[PDB]
Design a protein around this ligand. Sequence first.
Ligand code: CL
Ligand code: CL
Ligand code: MG
Ligand code: MG
Lengths: 10, 10, 236, 236
Amino acid sequence: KRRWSAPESR
Amino acid sequence: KRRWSAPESR
Amino acid sequence: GAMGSMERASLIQKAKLAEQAERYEDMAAFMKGAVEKGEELSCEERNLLSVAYKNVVGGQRAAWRVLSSIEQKSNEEGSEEKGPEVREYREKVETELQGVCDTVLGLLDSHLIKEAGDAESRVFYLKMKGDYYRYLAEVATGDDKKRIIDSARSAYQEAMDISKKEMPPTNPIRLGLALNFSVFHYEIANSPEEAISLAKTTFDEAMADLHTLSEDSYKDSTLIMQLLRDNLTLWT
Amino acid sequence: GAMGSMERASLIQKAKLAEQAERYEDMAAFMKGAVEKGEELSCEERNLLSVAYKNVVGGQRAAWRVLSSIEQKSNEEGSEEKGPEVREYREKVETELQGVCDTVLGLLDSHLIKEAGDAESRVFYLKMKGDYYRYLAEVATGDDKKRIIDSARSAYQEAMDISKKEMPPTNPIRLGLALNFSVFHYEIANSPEEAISLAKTTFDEAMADLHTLSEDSYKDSTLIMQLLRDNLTLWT
Ligand SMILES: [Cl-]
Ligand SMILES: [Cl-]
Ligand SMILES: [Mg+2]
Ligand SMILES: [Mg+2]
């Protein structure tokens, strides 16, 4: 699994 | 479900 | 053309890289450049050409369908007037889609089809011609819609005639051609009975020929037969 | 600019249509046009800008990673020499990616950041500045790599300072900023301990503030906390 970065609010 | 059309060989 | 300075083999190599990277616009531009070198395409190269443009136009068609649906709702009774933007943007996507179809058809006409003498290449290209006229027909609404539909029909019909004479009923190109011509009948030409008949006869004649095939060919043929069966299930 | 003749409101309307159609290149061009009208962006408009470019650059980054991996294998011992094509095409994608990052950074510098006075807008834009310098850093290999990394660090640091002073620990922008700065530490700045410490402290301070939130705000905050927790699980 690839680390998360911040998702888009939309 | 949407009907199939021909897939790509690749 | 921007690919004029690149070697044919380098274009093919980069088309395969773009495929791996799911960069299908790049893939299509590379394969357009390879076609424009003027030499005939091998079986693998024809498939690279087809995959690239199928993915490009598939994204445009999906987007056009989203926008057309929004536009249709905007024209219902009691819908608040939102101005010209929905129509404008649907037309933008539609124009880009038409441009891609025209590009593909132009490659087939200059000069892929006229140089294609073997059944496998000639049927492949004529199926492609039918496909891209069908995509034009999906968005056509004006005085040329009938002529667009007849151009798709004619290309498919010539491909069917050759495929029936020159290829076994399990050939995957023959099967995918019949699948797409059946979809043409069902949703373009308003002929669902013809669509169903073609799908069933195509499935049944392939079934009867499976016994001639190796394990790998059997896998390739049954994959497309299952798509015919799925459409028959949806349509009946 | 090609969007100069379109109304700001029409650009925003079409950006939302492009989002629905998953046409993110179009979405980004529409929002670039809206920014270039010169008025500040609302909270929703900032999110439209961010979603569009995130998706565009996300596709380019994914493609660059595929191509970079192929290129690295080509430079292993015992690999057959295939010519310059892999490097050329990786450079093509890389250059296009850099161009998108430069475009976004140019919008922030002319003149989104200097006009942004509220904490929510100023932190949002500074986070974006850090993000797009981080994407430049992912592909940087030359004499400017250190300066690119420090530009990302500096933007994130200013955003963190403001967010800590002006926003609650559960604010989703503050949380996503800390998440991205922690990823910067982990995989750009070679500081995994700093990355882990930031992720843990951010999670723990948000946990302690959840009790102040409505049900909907609780959902927004816990969603990003779970991403911090997932990264901590991966990293420890
Ligand atoms: Cl438009
Ligand atoms: Cl290239
Ligand atoms: Mg009947
Ligand atoms: Mg330690």
